[PDB]
Amino acid sequence: FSVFEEITRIVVKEMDAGGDMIAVRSLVDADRFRCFHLVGEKRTFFGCRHYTTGLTLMDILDTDGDKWKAEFQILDNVDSTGELIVRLPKEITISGSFQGFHHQKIKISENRISQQYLATLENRKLKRELPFSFRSINTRENLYLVTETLETVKEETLKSDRQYKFWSQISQGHLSYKHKGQREVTIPPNRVLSYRVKQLVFPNKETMSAGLDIHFRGKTK
Amino acid sequence: FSVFEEITRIVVKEMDAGGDMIAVRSLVDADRFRCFHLVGEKRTFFGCRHYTTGLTLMDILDTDGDKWKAEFQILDNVDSTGELIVRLPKEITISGSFQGFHHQKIKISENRISQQYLATLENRKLKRELPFSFRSINTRENLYLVTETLETVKEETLKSDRQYKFWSQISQGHLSYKHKGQREVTIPPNRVLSYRVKQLVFPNKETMSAGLDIHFRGKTK
Amino acid sequence: FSVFEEITRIVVKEMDAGGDMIAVRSLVDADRFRCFHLVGEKRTFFGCRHYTTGLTLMDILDTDGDKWKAEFQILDNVDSTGELIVRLPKEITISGSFQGFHHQKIKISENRISQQYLATLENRKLKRELPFSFRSINTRENLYLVTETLETVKEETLKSDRQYKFWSQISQGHLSYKHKGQREVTIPPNRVLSYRVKQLVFPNKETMSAGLDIHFRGKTK
Amino acid sequence: FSVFEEITRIVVKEMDAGGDMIAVRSLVDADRFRCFHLVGEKRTFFGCRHYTTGLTLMDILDTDGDKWKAEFQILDNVDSTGELIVRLPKEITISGSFQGFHHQKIKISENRISQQYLATLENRKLKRELPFSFRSINTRENLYLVTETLETVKEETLKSDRQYKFWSQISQGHLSYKHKGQREVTIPPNRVLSYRVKQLVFPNKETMSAGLDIHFRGKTK
């Protein structure tokens, strides 16, 4: 019934079948889910569904640290229809039938950030007395960062739908149940949907890295 | 349900029946999947499906190392339709029926790189302190390179489709299930789809080669 | 399902019923499958299907070695239709029906190379330190060359088609299966399709020849 | 399914019922199947079908050796239709039905060569160090030559057709099989189709002759 993970998963699929690319849940702090930003701990309830927290990490601007593709377009339509109905030995005619047609008018822009600039970032002196040490140590999420800025300049348009129909009969008792809920969302221009993973380890003074998509969280920081 | 491996496999087929030519999964870092670039380790789950990592290898430009066909066209249509349906002794009418018509408007360009220039490349002094040694030794993918630049200048057009229909009956219970999902992708002009294999072995100081399509990975580097 | 061997086999048939003339698989390095070029080792899986590798052999240009018919036309159509269907004692109605109509607009040009020039080529001093000795000795394909340049100046037009229809029934279970895939390829002007065989033996210093169509590979070089 | 032997056999029939006159398989080196040229060894598989090799024999031009009818026309049509069908005790209805209508627009020209000039040719001093002695002795085909130049100045037009229809039934199993393949070839102007036989014996220094149509190959040269 969520829609906002779905569009990010079309982006994910356009990358790989549930592989490298990562998705976000919502877009108040997703526009601020740019580089140098965190994620929450991961649980496996109702599929892949993790937590999220989006504070900042910039500390110093002594040396050169903040110096600065074409439009990519997705007019796609994805259809998912399915009816599962089963009758029980208690003459219960359990039923369900859903259908959803999603229209995506996804627009994507790109802001290039250098890959060796990541190493330049570890070359930065990590020191900040912002009130995040206590909660960061309490959580120990071993936060990761993003590789490159994947920006959007979109119109306000996504659509969705589902249906459901359930019947039952326990003791000559009729039961019919129907529902048709169609949804759609106004999607705003300049927001962030999909991001990457690059592990960072934080000794209390200076940090170090761990390269490839380490979302299996274990660290003694 | 992937589409981006398919078009690369039309290129592969236009080379050989699943033989020499090699395919890529996606095209954010495929435009940067030019020469001097890596691939991930290979597994055999769900057919031939490997990993990918696309960092760079250029180290020195002391001597002449960076000095610099017509349009090739594919207006093809490939059709794949199939219905597999089987009934079980439990009166289950298991069903499935899919169909996909793919329209490819593939455009290809060529940027010539000399073959003896490969030997000139091994004649280069291999020395770089970029942070890749630790992860490269951890992975030991015995990376390979590409032979010649296979470039594209394309329009934004590929199409695809599938369908599915499944029924069932366990205890006088009706179940009907249908789905029709048609997809299409906007393909951008200047990207890389298919590449080649040429094995390189890396002693810590100076490297050496291994010629023909060694994708069977074993090396003690 | 390959098309590119087929057109070369129309050329082969216009020579002889699967006899002297030889075919190639694809045309990125087929334009560079001119004289002085190699082929891969031969296996007999799925009919006559060999490997291919297309590096160069020119070493010296001390003496006269690089000094330099009308258009031949094929507007043909070849039809191949066939239905094989068999019913099993398990009431399985195994079926298959294919059809393909191929339209060839083949254009051919000729660049004359002297036949005694072959002997002049063995009179050349064979000496080259290009990195091919190691892999050539590892392979031992006892490479052959081509007799005369068979060039093309073509338009972009070949067509093809196939169909298939399979049914089955194991335990009162219906199964119907159909597929219609029509293909066509844009054929480019100046490429090479068919070539010849002339055996060469390579002692490490100077080479020698072996005349007629020795594709049965055995040599102790 | 060959067409190029057929037209030569219309020429042969216009000479005699499979008698004196001889036919060729194809026409890349048939234009160079002029006088002083060879043929391959003969085998009796699938009717009269021999091998072919077309190198040259001219050695000297010291004395007069290279000093130099109307158009003959064949607008004919030959029809060949036939259905052979047989039913087996295994209720197999083996079938076959073919038909072919061939339209020949054959054009023929004549270049006169003197018959006593043949004796003048044996009067020539036979001496040539071209690399053909080794392979000629290895083959021992006791090559023959041609009597008179039978040239053509043709348009590009021959046609052909065949059909086939096969049915079967082994165990109440239906099988129907049909095919309709019509072919046609663009025939080029100045080529050679039919030639003659005159035996030559080659002692290592000087040669000798053997007159009439000795295609029964035996010689100790």
The 3-class secondary structure across chain B, one letter per residue, is CCCHHHHHHHHHHHHCCCCCCEECCCCCCCCCCCCCCCCCCEECCCCCEECCCCCCCCCCCCCCCCCCCCCEEEEEEEEEEEECCEECCCCCEECCEEEEEEEEEEEEEEECCCCHHHHHHHCCCCCCCCCCHHHHHHHCCCCECCCCEEECCCCCCEEEEEEEEEEECCCCCCEEEEEEEEEEECCCCCCCCEECCCEEECCCCCCEEECCCCCCCCCCC
> Could you tell me which residues come within 8 angstroms of residue B1 by beta carbon, excluding any fewer than 6 positions away?
A13, A17, B162
Query: Of D131, D156, D177, which is closest to C83 when you measure between CB atoms?
Result: D177
In this structure, chain A runs to a length of 221
Q: Is B120 on the interface with C (CB under 8 A)?
A: no
- Does residue C58 sit at the B interface (CB-CB below 8 Å)? no
The alpha helices in chain D, defined as continuous H runs, are 4-15, 116-122, 133-139
Alpha-carbon gap, residue B48 to B42, rounded angstroms: 8
Distance from chain centroid for Cα B220: 26
Of B15, B119, B150, nearest to C26 by CB-CB distance is B15
- Which residues, at least 6 apart from C104, have a Cβ–Cβ distance to it below 8 Å? C7, C10, C74, C75, C76, C77, C78, C158
The pair of three-digit structure tokens given for residue A174, joined into one six-digit string: 């009729």
Is residue B205 within 8 angstroms of chain A, CB to CB?
A: no
Give the integer Cα–Cα distance in Å for C173 and C168: 8
- Asked whether C56 and C36 are in contact (CB, 8 A), the reply is yes
On whether any CB of chain B is under 8 Å from the CB of A57, the answer is no
Task: Please give the torsion angle defined by the CA atoms of residues C118, C119, C120 and C126, in that order, rounded to the nearest 10 degrees.
Answer: 90
Q: How far apart are CA A12 and CA A48, in angstroms?
A: 13
Q: At A6, is the secondary structure helix, strand, or coil?
A: helix
Could you give phi then psi for residue C179, rounded to 5 degrees? -160, 135
Q: How far is CA B47 from CA A73, B18, B43, B196, D83, in A?
A: 30, 12, 9, 19, 48
* The pair of three-digit structure tokens given for residue B212, joined into one six-digit string: 């023909």
Question: For residue C87, which residues of chain D lie inside 8 Å, CB to CB?
Answer: 171-174
Neighbouring C-beta atoms of residue D83, cutoff 10 Å: 12
Please judge whether C134 and B211 are an interchain contact, meaning their C-beta atoms are less than 8 angstroms apart. Answer: yes
Asked whether A and B share 3 or more beta-carbon pairs under 8 angstroms, the answer is yes
Environment class of C65 (CB within 10 Å of its CB; exposed 0-12, middle 13-18, buried 19+):
middle
Q: Which of C122, A74, A119, C117 lies closest to B56 in space, CA to CA?
A: A119
- Judge whether C28 is closer than 8 Å to chain D, CB to CB: no
Give every CB contact of residue D133 below 8 A, 6+ residues apart in sequence. Answer: none
D45–C contact, CB cutoff 8 A: no
Backbone angles phi and psi of C82, in degrees to 5: -165, 130
CA atoms within 13 A on the CB side of B56: 11
Token duo for residue B155: 């329009």
End-to-end Cα distance, chain B: 37
Residues in chain B: 221
Where b means 16+ CB within 10 Å and e means fewer, C68-78 reads eeeebebebeb
Contact B76 C185 (CB under 8 A): yes
With contacts defined as CB-CB under 8 Å, which chain B residues touch A70? 188
Q: How far apart are CA A196 and CA A183, in angstroms?
A: 29
Compute the distance between CA of residue B142 and CA of residue B42 in angstroms, rounded to an integer.
11
Total residues belonging to chain C: 221
* Backbone φ, ψ for residue A159 (5° rounding): -130, 165
Candidates A81, A84, A87; nearest CB to B171:
A87
Q: How many Å lie between the alpha carbon of D79 and the closest alpha carbon of chain C? A: 20
CB distance A177 to A107 below 8 Å? no
Q: Is B16 on the interface with C (CB under 8 A)?
A: yes
Report the distance separating Cα D78 and Cα D101, nearest Å.
6
**What's the rounded Cα separation, in Å, for the pair B12 and B4?**
13
- List CB contacts (< 8 A) between A82 and chain B: 177, 179
Separation in Å, CA A74 to CA A125, A160, D12, D160, D174 = 41, 16, 69, 52, 50
- Residue C93 to residue C96: CA distance in whole angstroms: 10
Answer yes or no: are the C-beta atoms of D104 and D10 closer than 8 Å: yes
* Inter-residue contact D107 to D155 (CB < 8 Å): yes
- Integer Cα distance of D116 and B140 in angstroms: 81
Query: How many residues are there in chain D?
Result: 221
Residues in chain B within 8 Å Cβ distance of A83: 175-178
Which of helix, strand or coil describes residue D8?
Answer: helix
Q: How far is C73 from chain B (nearest CA, A)?
A: 22
Could you tell me which residues come within 8 angstroms of residue A28 by beta carbon, excluding any fewer than 6 positions away? Answer: none
**Out of C4, C26, C179, whose CB is closest to B81?**
C179
Compute the count of residue pairs across chains C and D with CB atoms less than 8 Å apart.
60
Closest residue of chain C to D5, computed from CA coordinates: C16
Cβ–Cβ of C73/D186 closer than 8 Å? yes
CA distance C169 to chain B (A): 8
Does residue B87 belong to the interface with chain C, where contact is any CB pair within 8 Å?
A: yes
Helix (H, G, I), strand (E, B) or coil at D118: helix
Q: Are B161 and B183 in contact (CB under 8 A)?
A: yes
Structure token digits, residue A125: 């002196």
Task: Provide φ and ψ at A88, rounded to 5°.
Answer: -95, 160
Coil/strand/helix, residue D104: strand
Cβ-contact A116, A177 below 8 angstroms:
no
Task: Tell whether C16 lies on the interface with D, counting CB pairs under 8 A.
Answer: yes
DSSP-derived pairing of the beta strands A42-43 and A49-50: antiparallel
Residues 6+ apart with CB under 8 A from D60: D124, D125, D127, D128
* Tokens describing residue D32: 């160079």
Cα-to-chain-centroid distance, residue A166? 32
Q: Is A145 buried (19+), middle (13-18) or exposed (0-12) by CB count in 10 A?
A: buried
Q: Touching check for A72 and chain B: CB below 8 Å?
A: yes
